[PDB]
Amino acid sequence: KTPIVNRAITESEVLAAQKAWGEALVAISTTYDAKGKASAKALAEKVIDDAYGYQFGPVLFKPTLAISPRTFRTTRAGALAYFVGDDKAFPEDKGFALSSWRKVEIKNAAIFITGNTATTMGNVIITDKQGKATTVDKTWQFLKDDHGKLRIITHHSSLPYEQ
Amino acid sequence: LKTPIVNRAITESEVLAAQKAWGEALVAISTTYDAKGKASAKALAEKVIDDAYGYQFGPVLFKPTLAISPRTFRTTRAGALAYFVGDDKAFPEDKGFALSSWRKVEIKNAAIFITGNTATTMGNVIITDKQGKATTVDKTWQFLKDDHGKLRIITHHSSLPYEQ
Amino acid sequence: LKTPIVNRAITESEVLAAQKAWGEALVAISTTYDAKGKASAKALAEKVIDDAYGYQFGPVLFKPTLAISPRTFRTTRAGALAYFVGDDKAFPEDKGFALSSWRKVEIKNAAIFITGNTATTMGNVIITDKQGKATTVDKTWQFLKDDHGKLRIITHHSSLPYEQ
Amino acid sequence: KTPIVNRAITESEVLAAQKAWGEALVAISTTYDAKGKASAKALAEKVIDDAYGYQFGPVLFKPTLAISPRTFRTTRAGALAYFVGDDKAFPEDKGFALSSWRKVEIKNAAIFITGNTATTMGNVIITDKQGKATTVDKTWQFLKDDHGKLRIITHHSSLPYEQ
């Protein structure tokens, strides 16, 4: 068979990367519930290093519950802080991943594959240990890196508009 | 003579220009309604959506600021028009976002990612009406440079800043 | 219902298909000349170049196998047509490559690189005439997937194997 | 100023990467003339690691003077062998870089920038220590890697057709 390099993203790679983020959020949450803040922060660090693209420079990350001065988490510390708190530079952050999450459901509205990147827009439903479901409107953008792995370079999460 | 060259890549200046052109268009639809009423605004909004968005390629990933939780994702031209100018029984909750007498748009980028043929921006956009009432949104755009070298919106996620 | 999706990426199967379609086209021009003469071949070559190449975007990076050292690079539609079918005073050394009664094209890829919106192939192509005379070339193609999802040649470098 | 990531290639980046290859060929050639085969092979190894993209998988490399069985140098060893010989697996290779090259001139016919990659097609003129000029027809394709540096993923070199 002809030796090939495929820098392009497939549908199945995008769907996998969406789930992988869900699994990573939950893994952080159950690890906090079970082993405390220090173990979660260390798990969260490896998760961000793995699934995000802060290595390339800024990530276009607007987290769901980020407050109006510190809205855009363009740095690795900004992401970690949003998910597990424990950073005095982000004093409004208690840790979004620390609410005992257990189930994440992806409901895509549309996917756009532009070759090396892919953008998804739809709903994500995050359910805690007691079945308290939070619905968010989520845009992700994935870049396939030089090692063939999908990295979040864009992450816009918003609570559905009510009024 | 200079080497003939095809450039499908987006530059920073093309991205900033396309951001400003969307602002100008929102304001141009808003004044045209204040000045000449619904019909004129609608016809202008239609050319704007045909020009600045990329519904020609298939669905656009458009989550508008003030879109209500059943009709959240405007993946069709009609969805986008309806959001801006209303007047569509299929989007009954849409009075028209562009019809609030908008006069100034300010772009405050936090970050830009140029992935070659496309470019994503994230940051604040501040839209101010004739009375100086400022609406601040958190906005993500993605621009694709079409076969004719013009930047088209294929992704548009706008959200009100989270208030605790 | 299935999530609506835009796919501007090229797949392996799209690349192999586009390779085979170029072969089929060369053979279809060659037989059409053997069977119906110059005029018919020319009109067919024109639709082939308009279909399979990307002169619509600007220059194509086309270095044909048997192109002579003044007129080496066929960056214009006319250059490409002339190479295949001749009949152009502006390319006086061109008898027409496609007019040698070609009947079989075999693609032997050494490697494929899909860079997302484009895909490059390098390897051998073996073009055999009505008498079974095999011409082997070393060939590089680059395909771009246009706004309509069809693969267009923007790069075509063909060379006779180096003989010491 | 807004923090930005630019995975796109500019005209000036392509022109630089074309010259950089010229400089690298010559550097190998003068290093052989002056310090012998071992020093050139070691310089040539770092040159290929740097300017080519064998890290991603196969490179679409058809060298000017490569012979009909071993035409396509899809492996790092194939490239090294073509440029400096000294590999019994490529027995027809004496070393293309070992002919005392001194001047390389790029004459582009056309450049196509497809975002993350750029293809050049034109002439390259390589002149030795005595002014013996070899003209080649050259296609290059450059991919900007995750670290912002241009890497040759395609290299088709042919002697101009004579007859």
Numbering used by the authors:
A (entry chain B), D (entry chain B): 43 to 205
B (entry chain A), C (entry chain A): 42 to 205
Please quote the paper that reports this structure.
In the present study, we report a novel type of CAs that has been characterized in the eukaryotic microalga Bigelowiella natans and the cyanobacterium Anabaena sp. PCC7120. Taken together, these results suggested that the COG4337 proteins are metal-free enzymes that catalyze the hydration of CO2 to HCO3-, but not the reverse reaction. We thus concluded that COG4337 proteins should be treated as a new variant of ι-class CAs.
Iodide ions have been reported as an inhibitor in several classes of CAs. The results of size exclusion chromatography with multi-angle static light scattering (SEC-MALS) system showed that Bn86287 exists as dimers but all2909 exists as tetramers in solution.
